[PDB]
Design a protein around this motif. Structure first.
Motif, PDB file in Angstrom:
ATOM      1  N   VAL A   1       0.981  -1.370   0.065  1.00  0.00           N
ATOM      2  CA  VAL A   1       0.233  -0.209   0.384  1.00  0.00           C
ATOM      3  C   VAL A   1       1.055   1.257  -0.464  1.00  0.00           C
ATOM      4  CG1 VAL A   1      -1.497   1.095   1.045  1.00  0.00           C
ATOM      5  CG2 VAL A   1      -1.378  -1.883   0.951  1.00  0.00           C
ATOM      6  N   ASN A   2       0.328   2.054  -0.894  1.00  0.00           N
ATOM      7  CA  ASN A   2       1.169   3.218  -0.920  1.00  0.00           C
ATOM      8  C   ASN A   2       0.452   4.467  -0.305  1.00  0.00           C
ATOM      9  OD1 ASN A   2      -0.151   4.760  -3.381  1.00  0.00           O
ATOM     10  ND2 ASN A   2       1.472   2.949  -4.608  1.00  0.00           N
ATOM     11  N   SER A   3       0.905   5.757  -0.806  1.00  0.00           N
ATOM     12  CA  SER A   3       0.012   7.278  -0.210  1.00  0.00           C
ATOM     13  C   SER A   3      -1.283   7.900  -0.764  1.00  0.00           C
ATOM     14  CB  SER A   3       0.634   8.085   0.718  1.00  0.00           C
ATOM     15  OG  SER A   3       0.151   9.960   0.370  1.00  0.00           O
ATOM     16  N   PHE A   4      -0.815   7.028  -2.877  1.00  0.00           N
ATOM     17  CA  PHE A   4      -1.604   8.456  -4.151  1.00  0.00           C
ATOM     18  C   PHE A   4      -3.076   7.937  -3.484  1.00  0.00           C
ATOM     19  CE2 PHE A   4       3.029   7.237  -5.236  1.00  0.00           C
ATOM     20  CZ  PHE A   4       3.657   8.563  -5.903  1.00  0.00           C
ATOM     21  N   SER A   5      -3.650   8.529  -3.697  1.00  0.00           N
ATOM     22  CA  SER A   5      -4.920   9.030  -3.857  1.00  0.00           C
ATOM     23  C   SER A   5      -6.253   9.693  -4.998  1.00  0.00           C
ATOM     24  CB  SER A   5      -5.112   9.243  -2.699  1.00  0.00           C
ATOM     25  OG  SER A   5      -6.807   9.506  -2.449  1.00  0.00           O
ATOM     26  N   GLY A   6      -6.822   8.804  -5.489  1.00  0.00           N
ATOM     27  CA  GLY A   6      -8.136   9.483  -6.470  1.00  0.00           C
ATOM     28  C   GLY A   6      -7.273   9.182  -7.566  1.00  0.00           C
ATOM     29  N   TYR A   7      -6.431   8.608  -8.328  1.00  0.00           N
ATOM     30  CA  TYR A   7      -5.883   7.631  -9.100  1.00  0.00           C
ATOM     31  C   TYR A   7      -6.634   6.794 -10.194  1.00  0.00           C
ATOM     32  CZ  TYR A   7      -1.651  10.480  -8.480  1.00  0.00           C
ATOM     33  OH  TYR A   7      -0.941  11.782  -8.106  1.00  0.00           O
ATOM     34  N   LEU A   8      -7.039   6.829 -11.201  1.00  0.00           N
ATOM     35  CA  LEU A   8      -7.087   5.680 -11.688  1.00  0.00           C
ATOM     36  C   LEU A   8      -6.205   4.488 -12.540  1.00  0.00           C
ATOM     37  CD1 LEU A   8      -9.909   4.534 -14.291  1.00  0.00           C
ATOM     38  CD2 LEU A   8      -8.907   6.240 -15.874  1.00  0.00           C
ATOM     39  N   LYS A   9      -6.657   3.828 -12.482  1.00  0.00           N
ATOM     40  CA  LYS A   9      -5.905   2.587 -12.578  1.00  0.00           C
ATOM     41  C   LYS A   9      -6.016   1.881 -13.970  1.00  0.00           C
ATOM     42  CE  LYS A   9      -3.867  -2.003 -10.882  1.00  0.00           C
ATOM     43  NZ  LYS A   9      -2.723  -1.466 -10.988  1.00  0.00           N
ATOM     44  N   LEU A  10      -4.310   2.339 -15.005  1.00  0.00           N
ATOM     45  CA  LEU A  10      -5.203   1.944 -16.624  1.00  0.00           C
ATOM     46  C   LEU A  10      -4.632   0.714 -16.333  1.00  0.00           C
ATOM     47  CD1 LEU A  10      -3.080   5.647 -17.876  1.00  0.00           C
ATOM     48  CD2 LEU A  10      -5.541   4.615 -17.758  1.00  0.00           C
ATOM     49  N   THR A  11      -3.099  -0.194 -16.000  1.00  0.00           N
ATOM     50  CA  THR A  11      -2.887  -1.284 -15.990  1.00  0.00           C
ATOM     51  C   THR A  11      -2.095  -1.758 -14.910  1.00  0.00           C
ATOM     52  OG1 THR A  11      -0.382  -0.017 -16.320  1.00  0.00           O
ATOM     53  CG2 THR A  11      -1.806  -0.571 -18.347  1.00  0.00           C
ATOM     54  N   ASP A  12      -1.373  -2.881 -14.846  1.00  0.00           N
ATOM     55  CA  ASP A  12      -1.260  -3.182 -13.862  1.00  0.00           C
ATOM     56  C   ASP A  12      -0.322  -2.807 -12.497  1.00  0.00           C
ATOM     57  OD1 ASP A  12      -0.392  -5.596 -12.035  1.00  0.00           O
ATOM     58  OD2 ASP A  12       2.061  -5.219 -12.469  1.00  0.00           O
ATOM     59  N   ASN A  13       0.460  -1.609 -13.682  1.00  0.00           N
ATOM     60  CA  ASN A  13       1.779  -0.692 -12.982  1.00  0.00           C
ATOM     61  C   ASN A  13       1.084   0.617 -13.174  1.00  0.00           C
ATOM     62  OD1 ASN A  13       2.343  -1.711 -15.532  1.00  0.00           O
ATOM     63  ND2 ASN A  13       3.962  -0.463 -15.299  1.00  0.00           N
ATOM     64  N   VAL A  14       0.404   1.331 -13.613  1.00  0.00           N
ATOM     65  CA  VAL A  14       0.415   2.991 -14.683  1.00  0.00           C
ATOM     66  C   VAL A  14      -0.905   3.146 -13.951  1.00  0.00           C
ATOM     67  CG1 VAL A  14       0.096   4.581 -16.503  1.00  0.00           C
ATOM     68  CG2 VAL A  14       1.435   2.276 -16.511  1.00  0.00           C
ATOM     69  N   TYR A  15      -1.131   4.376 -12.789  1.00  0.00           N
ATOM     70  CA  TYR A  15      -1.779   5.333 -13.198  1.00  0.00           C
ATOM     71  C   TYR A  15      -2.521   6.602 -13.565  1.00  0.00           C
ATOM     72  CZ  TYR A  15      -2.039   1.044  -9.423  1.00  0.00           C
ATOM     73  OH  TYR A  15      -2.435  -0.138  -8.792  1.00  0.00           O
ATOM     74  N   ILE A  16      -3.196   7.337 -13.341  1.00  0.00           N
ATOM     75  CA  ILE A  16      -3.486   8.564 -13.721  1.00  0.00           C
ATOM     76  C   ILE A  16      -4.551   9.517 -12.777  1.00  0.00           C
ATOM     77  CG2 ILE A  16      -4.472   7.569 -15.399  1.00  0.00           C
ATOM     78  CD1 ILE A  16      -3.034   9.993 -17.478  1.00  0.00           C
ATOM     79  N   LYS A  17      -4.374  10.983 -13.141  1.00  0.00           N
ATOM     80  CA  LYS A  17      -5.015  11.514 -12.372  1.00  0.00           C
ATOM     81  C   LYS A  17      -4.694  13.007 -13.075  1.00  0.00           C
ATOM     82  CE  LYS A  17      -5.768  13.142  -7.163  1.00  0.00           C
ATOM     83  NZ  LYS A  17      -4.849  12.943  -6.408  1.00  0.00           N
ATOM     84  N   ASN A  18      -6.135  14.039 -13.046  1.00  0.00           N
ATOM     85  CA  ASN A  18      -6.737  15.359 -13.030  1.00  0.00           C
ATOM     86  C   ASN A  18      -5.747  15.834 -12.181  1.00  0.00           C
ATOM     87  OD1 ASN A  18      -8.231  17.751 -13.852  1.00  0.00           O
ATOM     88  ND2 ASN A  18      -6.441  17.856 -14.470  1.00  0.00           N
ATOM     89  N   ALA A  19      -4.087  16.330 -12.238  1.00  0.00           N
ATOM     90  CA  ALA A  19      -3.999  17.074 -10.759  1.00  0.00           C
ATOM     91  C   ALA A  19      -2.391  18.139 -11.587  1.00  0.00           C
ATOM     92  CB  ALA A  19      -3.621  16.010  -9.602  1.00  0.00           C
ATOM     93  N   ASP A  20      -2.234  18.961 -10.269  1.00  0.00           N
ATOM     94  CA  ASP A  20      -0.891  20.001 -10.687  1.00  0.00           C
ATOM     95  C   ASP A  20       0.002  18.891  -9.754  1.00  0.00           C
ATOM     96  OD1 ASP A  20       0.945  22.202 -10.318  1.00  0.00           O
ATOM     97  OD2 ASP A  20      -0.484  23.665  -9.793  1.00  0.00           O
ATOM     98  N   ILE A  21       0.804  18.629 -10.475  1.00  0.00           N
ATOM     99  CA  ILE A  21       2.719  17.952 -10.310  1.00  0.00           C
ATOM    100  C   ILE A  21       2.693  17.989  -8.463  1.00  0.00           C
ATOM    101  CG2 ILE A  21       4.110  18.416 -11.822  1.00  0.00           C
ATOM    102  CD1 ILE A  21       5.036  15.743 -11.862  1.00  0.00           C
ATOM    103  N   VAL A  22       2.982  19.800  -8.974  1.00  0.00           N
ATOM    104  CA  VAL A  22       3.223  20.697  -7.715  1.00  0.00           C
ATOM    105  C   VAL A  22       2.170  20.245  -6.582  1.00  0.00           C
ATOM    106  CG1 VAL A  22       3.529  23.011  -6.867  1.00  0.00           C
ATOM    107  CG2 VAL A  22       4.441  22.060  -8.691  1.00  0.00           C
ATOM    108  N   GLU A  23       0.642  20.666  -6.545  1.00  0.00           N
ATOM    109  CA  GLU A  23       0.355  20.546  -5.558  1.00  0.00           C
ATOM    110  C   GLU A  23       0.137  18.457  -4.795  1.00  0.00           C
ATOM    111  OE1 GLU A  23      -0.673  22.312  -3.584  1.00  0.00           O
ATOM    112  OE2 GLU A  23       0.114  24.035  -4.835  1.00  0.00           O
ATOM    113  N   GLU A  24       0.152  17.580  -5.837  1.00  0.00           N
ATOM    114  CA  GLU A  24       0.077  15.773  -5.966  1.00  0.00           C
ATOM    115  C   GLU A  24       2.399  16.157  -4.559  1.00  0.00           C
ATOM    116  OE1 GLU A  24      -2.555  13.970  -6.201  1.00  0.00           O
ATOM    117  OE2 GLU A  24      -1.367  12.389  -5.245  1.00  0.00           O
TER     118      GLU A  24
END
Ligand SMILES: COc1ccc2[nH]cc(CC(=O)O)c2c1
Length: 167
Positions: A1-24
Motif C-alpha cells: 500500500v502507498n499514499s497516492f489517492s484518487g488515481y484511475l488504474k490504467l494497467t497493472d503498474n500505471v495510474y493517472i489523475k487530473n492534478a497539479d504535480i506541484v500540489e500532488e
C-alpha cells in the motif's frame, strides 16, 4: 500500500489523475518526483519552472552546480538530484522536444529511466509545451515502464481525452 489517492488504474503498474504535480508532490512527498527537464536543466517553464518555483529556486541552484561539474544531459537521459521540499529525490528526465526537432523515438529511451525506481510521481514526457502528442506519450509510458508510475495530468480537458481514448 502507498499514499497516492484518487488515481484511475490504467494497467497493472500505471495510474493517472487530473492534478497539479506541484500540489500532488507537496501532499504525498513521494520518494521520486519526475521533472520534465531539458539537457541544460534550465527550469524556465512548464513542469520544470513550476517545480523549480515551488522550491524557491533551490532546484535551479543545485542544477547549475550539477551542469558546471558534469555538462549537459543527453536527450533520453536523466539524473537524480534532490527533491527539496517536494520529494526525497527528483529524477530529471529529458524527453525529446518536438518544438526543437528531436527524434520522437527517443521518448521510449526517456521512459526507460523510470524503471530504475520502484515508485514515481511523474508527468507525461514530451507532451504539453514539448510538442509531442500526449496520447502517444501515454501509450509509450504504458508499453515501457514496468515500475509503479502515478501520472499527474494538469489539463482536465486533456485528462478526460486520455482516459476516454485509452486502449
Ligand atoms: C507546460 O509545461 C508542460 C510540460 C510537460 C507536460 N507534459 C504534459 C503536459 C500537459 C499537462 O499535464 O496538462 C505538460 C506541460
Amino acid at each position: 500500500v502507498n499514499s497516492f489517492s484518487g488515481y484511475l488504474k490504467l494497467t497493472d503498474n500505471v495510474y493517472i489523475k487530473n492534478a497539479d504535480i506541484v500540489e500532488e508532490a507537496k501532499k504525498v512527498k513521494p520518494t521520486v518526483v519526475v521533472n520534465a527537464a531539458n539537457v541544460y536543466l534550465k527550469h524556465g517553464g512548464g513542469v520544470a519552472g513550476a517545480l523549480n518555483k515551488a522550491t524557491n529556486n533551490a532546484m535551479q541552484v543545485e542544477s547549475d552546480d550539477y551542469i558546471a561539474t558534469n555538462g549537459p544531459l543527453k536527450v533520453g537521459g536523466s539524473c537524480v538530484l534532490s527533491g527539496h521540499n517536494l520529494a526525497k529525490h527528483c529524477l530529471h528526465v529529458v524527453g525529446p522536444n518536438v518544438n526543437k526537432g528531436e527524434d520522437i523515438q527517443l521518448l521510449k529511451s526517456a521512459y526507460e529511466n523510470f524503471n530504475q525506481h520502484e515508485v514515481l510521481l511523474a508527468p507525461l514526457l514530451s507532451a504539453g509545451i514539448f510538442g509531442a502528442d500526449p496520447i502517444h506519450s501515454l501509450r509509450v509510458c504504458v508499453d515501457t515502464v514496468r515500475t509503479n508510475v502515478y501520472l499527474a495530468v494538469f489539463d482536465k480537458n486533456l485528462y478526460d481525452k486520455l482516459v476516454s481514448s485509452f486502449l
